[PDB]
Amino acid sequence: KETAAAKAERQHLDS
Amino acid sequence: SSSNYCNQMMKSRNLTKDRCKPVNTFVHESLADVQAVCSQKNVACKNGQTNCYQSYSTMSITDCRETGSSKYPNCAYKTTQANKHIIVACEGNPYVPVHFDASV
Question: Which family does it belong to (chain A)?
Answer without folding.
Answer: Belongs to the pancreatic ribonuclease family.
